[PDB]
């Protein structure tokens, strides 16, 4: 192989920077008004599932 | 001995030719194993890694 360690330091690269949502309020939306479901999406996607 | 004799003549001949002195070659490892080792040393080198 001389390729696959390609691949391997790609996966890690991109492992070291996890990304997930971030909601954020519209223009004139209140400015608590995106607490609550993005504290439920962190609490759903925290789980070993949605990181494998 | 500083020397090394060599019998000259022979009895139902003339002289022995004496050609010139012939050796064994010596054991080489012939370059396509070396470079094979060379190849395969570095190809290992290459896949070890885990990123």
């Known amino acids: ?52 | 001995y500083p020397y090394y004799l060599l019998n000259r003549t022979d009895e139902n001949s003339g002289d022995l030719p004496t050609q010139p002195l012939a050796y064994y070659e010596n054991p080489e490892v012939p370059q396509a194993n070396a470079y094979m080792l060379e190849a395969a040393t570095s190809a290992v080198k290459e896949v070890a890694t885990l990123g």
């Open chain 1, 1 to 52: 192989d001389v390729v696959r360690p390609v691949v391997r330091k790609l996966v890690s690269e991109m492992r070291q920077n996890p990304i997930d949502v971030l909601y954020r309020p519209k223009d004139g939306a209140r400015p608590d008004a995106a607490d609550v479901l993005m504290g439920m999406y962190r609490t759903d996607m925290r789980h070993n599932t949605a990181k494998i």
